[PDB]
Design a protein around this nucleic acid. Structure first.
Lengths: 82, 85, 94, 121
RNA sequence: GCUCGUAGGUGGUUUGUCGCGUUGUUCGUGAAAUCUCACGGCUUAACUGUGAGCGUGCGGGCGAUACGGGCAGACUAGAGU
RNA sequence: UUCGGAGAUACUCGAGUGGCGAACGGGUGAGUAACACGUGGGUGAUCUGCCCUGCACUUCGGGAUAAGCCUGGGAAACUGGGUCUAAUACCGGAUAGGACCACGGGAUGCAUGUCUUGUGGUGGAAAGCGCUUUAGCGGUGUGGGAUGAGCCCGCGGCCUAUCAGCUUGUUGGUGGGGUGACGGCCUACCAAGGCGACGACGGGUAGCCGGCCUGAGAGGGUGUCCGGCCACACUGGGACUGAGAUACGGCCCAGACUCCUACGGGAGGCAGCAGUGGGGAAUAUUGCACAAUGGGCGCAAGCCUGAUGCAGCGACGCCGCGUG
């Protein structure tokens, strides 16, 4: 029917969203790697970017912020461990 | 999904009446109203109003959004104006 | 009108139902099997009969043996249902 | 392809696998090519189909594994032998086929299966 | 066919106890419509409408403790030695 | 002004980007044997866009692009390339620090904890608009409300023992992830349990309830209309967008069944209204309209609305009057 705009715009939205999500998880990988290596300072910088990326997306409506809470809080504690 | 106030057509075909009720817009004409506050008849008395005029102020204070005819009923009672005053 | 905001809203909480049962077994690592004893009448005949159920007394520190009376209370699920928790030790077994 | 040869039935009739009884087209004919008619029985069949075990029916060869020379020098080779059941008046018993068929169908003169093809070769 | 005996059922006199059961009260709950009753409206009725009742029932809170039940304990005729 | 072609100037506006909804509403009850339903409790680390409401914000920028123009493909479906363009679209700066995180603290919990302060980190948008030419429309993060929804749980609501041994993701823990969220939900490791004759596993049958019918009632039968709740949408599977999907009129895959074709390759889903065929003893008009009501967008007028609202057919069934 004449509502294919619903589909097309869904394509744009999901495309950008999952691209963003992949970039987030990539950063997470780096942070966790910093935890494994022990470069706490680098992990802190990466955590700052994560703060400026994760919540940035959440403010774009990717999540309802709960994932940000679990990830930042848990990983900050992980960094507190190491 | 917001609470509004609708007029429910009830009774027999050609001499029905309107039950006054608070209800979400996503409900059917005859759903489980949150609470019924009075009734209305279109016949007999010209614009027959039978409204409690007690909880309207409450539900409006919550933010219930009445429809056009409901506004007219509220104004005839003065509850719209008295509430807003 | 105030420059601040709304303080709080008085929302009283509910309850967590408690039953006192018999300790069955703690052989599950941080959770104890307890026999839930109850009683109900048949809808028609009315005979009072006892009802026996089983519960999972999850707890972080087993502090009870077997046959002891224990007070159990409902909480959030933890494992396969895991609603019951160990609260009180009372009327210990001989 | 000759007698005592089992092959898959590439249609939606109900038959699964048939056994070559006799090639038509001439006495003492040894082998069939693409487009030839084989009389065959049914050994395996779909329960509830239109053909049961023991039924004798004509089927047309549409796939031959052994390389068949096409006039212009190219060769067609299929991984499997298969045939399609047809009623003796140019009236395929089924309604569609499973997979491709050969192109040497001028002599078949049954220009319908070629149209039911999901892919003529 | 008879007996035994497990689970389960059931279980004497009685002190005091818990008040689980039950009972009484109170709050909430038990939607509306439908049903009963009483009014009222469609020319009556059916029907609709109003109101009350009904909604037999749950939780919470509130008193007593008879009886049952559980715990603590006793006597003895029960039963047994 | 050619006198039959121009100038978007503009009321209007095809088409188009963007915004809302399209997940409600409508229908059906196959499957489902209790997850559901009913009832009642919990839901302290359950969410809750559009409404009301208190607070704060309500700034600075970039680039691309559809549309349009040229243009390719194919029978069509439908599509590539090149030009061209804005924005409440996209993107990057905070220029809130309530709130998110961590440490520490204060008031106050056992109901696995709420309020509140400090320390360190720390982000986000928003916009501008047309107009009544400023009447108005707005826009962002929050406090708490309100609604709705989710999660869990007690109890209750078929037959069968000619089904009694069921159970390694099962049972429990640690850790981790993930989730709106506690949660073997997931998952690495470890432990060896868990259910069950106070009917496990399995089979058969079935949408559930308020309620309908019967009956003196206890109970029985039933659960069709109407109303609430739950599931399903040619069959099966999976996911996105999204506040919220199993979603009839959304996509993708698979499969069946129809149809088109230039035969290469494509399109579709009335268990929505009416309607056709089939089935069968049998169940209706291709009806009128959106007046009120109802829902959505929009400042509103206005637009849509086979839902609701009205009509037509059968003595199909109740009530009621005649056939003096």
């Amino acid at each position: 029917k004449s509502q294919q705009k619903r589909n097309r715009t869904n394509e744009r939205a999901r495309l950008r969203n999952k691209a963003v999500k992949s970039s987030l998880r990539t950063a997470v990988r780096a942070f966790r790697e910093a935890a494994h290596a022990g470069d706490k300072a680098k992990a802190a910088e990466l955590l700052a970017s994560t703060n400026r990326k994760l919540d940035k997306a959440a403010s774009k409506g990717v999540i309802h912020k709960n994932q940000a809470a679990n990830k930042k809080s848990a990983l900050a504690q992980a960094l507190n461990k190491l | 999904m917001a609470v509004k106030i609708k007029l429910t057509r009830l009774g027999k075909i050609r001499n029905p009446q309107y039950r006054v009720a608070v209800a979400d817009a996503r409900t059917r004409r005859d759903g489980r109203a949150i609470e019924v506050i009075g009734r209305y008849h279109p016949k007999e008395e010209p614009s027959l109003i039978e409204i409690n005029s007690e909880r309207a102020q409450y539900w409006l204070s919550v933010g219930a959004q009445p429809t056009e005819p409901v506004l007219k009923l509220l104004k005839i009672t003065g509850d719209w104006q008295k509430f807003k005053g | 009108k105030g420059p601040k905001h709304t303080p709080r809203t008085p929302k009283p909480r509910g309850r967590r139902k408690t039953r006192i049962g018999y300790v069955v077994s703690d052989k599950m690592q941080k959770t104890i099997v307890v026999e839930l004893e109850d009683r109900m009448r048949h809808p028609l005949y009315g005979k009072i009969i006892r009802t026996t159920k089983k519960v999972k007394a999850h707890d972080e520190d087993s502090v009870a043996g077997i046959g002891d009376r224990v007070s159990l209370m409902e909480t959030r699920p933890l494992s396969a249902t895991k609603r019951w928790r160990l609260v009180e030790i009372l009327e210990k077994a001989k | 392809i000759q007698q005592e040869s089992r092959l898959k039935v590439a249609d939606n009739t109900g038959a699964k696998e048939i056994l070559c009884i006799r090639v038509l087209g001439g006495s003492s004919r040894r082998y069939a090519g693409i487009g030839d008619v084989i009389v065959a029985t049914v050994k395996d069949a779909i329960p509830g189909g239109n053909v049961k075990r023991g039924d004798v029916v004509k089927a047309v060869v549409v796939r031959t594994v052994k390389e068949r020379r096409r006039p212009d020098g190219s060769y067609i080779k299929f991984d499997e032998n298969a045939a399609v059941i047809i009623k003796p008046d140019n009236d395929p018993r089924g309604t569609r086929i499973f997979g491709p068929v050969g192109r040497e169908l001028r002599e078949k003169r049954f220009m319908k299966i070629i149209s039911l093809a999901p892919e003529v070769l």
